[PDB]
């Protein structure tokens, strides 16, 4: 089983303990660590933060304590417009140029592969996404001839039924991708003003409207579309989505007036690092959707939907029973990397909870 762990570039700028550098990562923890967001300029992959080469080096030295460890670099992300990806991939000339620029970059900085985070291809992009994966992989095979190890190629895909039908040809890109990561956590997406859990596991059978929103539906679906189990990796979140209530009501359906107030370290609306959530729980009321097997908490006029050690131990357990390739964890930096925020003395409590279940066969 694989344990893919995303690490983000901008977690270095957080104040106090919130700050995080590749330095704090346990090398023996995950199998694959995906460094977050490279960029594109003049049609070639390129750096993003001023000090990326430095940090590239720090992350890639962990492979010195753990040789089994594999690291990849990711291109795209939410704050990277899709029109941008879309326009590189639809002109074979600008496309072929980006591809050729990739292997040497990865090699110079010591990455074992590249990851595509084209955040949401559209109806008009399905065909080019395919071209890009196909051609990119071809380029990696041809390059392994120089007698060095073949660079890995992966992709982070949407888990929303309508998004998968609209922009992905799952059957095709699964042939060329080393693994596929399922973004199974943005379900109660950005819109609608009702309280709800962003990463529920099941249908929460007490809910009738949207069955397409949950890890289970998403997974079954991808399998039907043709992606093979041994390439699928299920996304697990390490952050919580927050709302500012608009009434005394706190149960399913309750009205929302907007996002939740920012975390003291995370500084961003509607979001909360896990270590922040640990502090938050003090004086907070905790509840747990039995149906979807995921917890939520309220305190004041704030309602937080999140994932704890056991809702996570559970998602992990599902993943195994359906025989998938492994689990993907979004942001080791959003977890309690110091281990001084969530009661117990453990470091990376959530990510290691997943690793425990994954390591028991």
Ligand X SMILES: *[C@@H]1O[C@H](CO)[C@@H](O[C@H]2O[C@H](CO)[C@@H](O)[C@H](O)[C@H]2NC(C)=O)[C@H](O)[C@H]1NC(C)=O
Give the position of tokens 């380029």. 139
> Is the Cβ of residue 96 or residue 320 nearer to ligand X in the bound state?
96
The answer to whether residues 40 and 47 touch, using CB atoms and an 8 Å cutoff, is no
Structure tokens at 314: 């559970």
For the CB of residue 36, give the shortest distance to ligand X in the complex, in Å.
Answer: 13
Q: How far is CA 132 from CA 15, 47, 60, 103, 175, in A?
A: 39, 20, 27, 14, 13
> Is the Cβ of residue 106 or residue 358 nearer to ligand X in the bound state?
106
The answer to whether residues 195 and 289 touch, using CB atoms and an 8 Å cutoff, is no
> Is the Cβ of residue 41 or residue 64 nearer to ligand X in the bound state?
41
The answer to whether residues 295 and 200 touch, using CB atoms and an 8 Å cutoff, is no
For the CB of residue 291, give the shortest distance to ligand X in the complex, in Å.
Answer: 42
> Is the Cβ of residue 66 or residue 97 nearer to ligand X in the bound state?
97
Query: What is the gyration radius of the CA atoms in the chain, in angstroms?
Result: 20
For the CB of residue 135, give the shortest distance to ligand X in the complex, in Å.
Answer: 21
For the CB of residue 38, give the shortest distance to ligand X in the complex, in Å.
Answer: 9
The answer to whether residues 125 and 86 touch, using CB atoms and an 8 Å cutoff, is yes
List interacting residues with ligand X (CB under 6 A): 39-41, 48
For the CB of residue 71, give the shortest distance to ligand X in the complex, in Å.
Answer: 21
Q: Which residue is nearest to ligand X (CB)?
A: 41
> Is the Cβ of residue 98 or residue 265 nearer to ligand X in the bound state?
98
Q: C-alpha angle 10/3/220, rounded to 5°?
A: 105
């Amino acid at each position: 089983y694989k344990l893919i762990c995303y690490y983000t570039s901008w977690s270095q700028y957080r104040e106090g303990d919130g700050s995080c550098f590749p330095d704090a990562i346990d090398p023996f923890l995950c199998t694959h660590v995906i460094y977050s967001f490279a960029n594109i300029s003049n049609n070639e992959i390129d750096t993003w933060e001023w000090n990326d080469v430095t940090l590239y080096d720090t992350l890639n030295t962990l492979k010195n304590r753990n040789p089994k460890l594999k690291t990849l670099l990711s291109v795209g992300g939410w704050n990277f417009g899709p029109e941008r990806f879309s326009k590189i991939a639809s002109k074979t000339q600008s496309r072929r140029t980006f591809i050729k620029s990739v292997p040497p970059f990865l090699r110079t900085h010591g990455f074992d592969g590249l990851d595509l985070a084209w955040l949401y291809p559209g109806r008009r992009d399905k065909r080019h996404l395919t071209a890009l994966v196909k051609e990119m992989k071809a380029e990696f095979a041809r390059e392994a001839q120089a007698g060095t190890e073949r660079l890995l190629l992966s992709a982070a895909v949407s888990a929303g039924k309508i998004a998968i039908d609209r922009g992905y040809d799952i059957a095709q890109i699964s042939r060329h991708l080393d693994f596929i990561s399922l973004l199974t956590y943005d379900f109660h997406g950005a819109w609608r003003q009702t309280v709800g859990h962003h990463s529920p596991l099941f249908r929460g059978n007490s809910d009738a409207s949207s069955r397409f929103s949950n890890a289970d539906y998403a997974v079954s679906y991808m399998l039907r579309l043709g992606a093979p189990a041994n390439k699928l990796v299920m996304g697990i979140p390490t952050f919580g989505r927050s709302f500012t209530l608009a009434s005394s009501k706190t149960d399913v359906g309750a009205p929302i007036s907007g996002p939740g107030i920012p975390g003291r370290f995370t500084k961003e609306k509607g979001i909360l690092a896990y270590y922040e959530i640990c502090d938050f729980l003090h004086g907070a009321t905790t509840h747990r959707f039995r149906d979807q097997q995921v917890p939520y908490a309220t305190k004041g006029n704030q309602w937080v939907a999140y994932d704890d050690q056991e809702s996570v131990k559970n998602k992990a357990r599902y993943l195994k029973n359906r025989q998938l390739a492994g689990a993907m964890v979004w942001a080791l930096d959003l977890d309690d990397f110091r281990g001084t925020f969530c009661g117990q003395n453990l470091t990376f409590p959530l990510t290691s909870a997943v690793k425990d279940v994954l390591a028991r066969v």
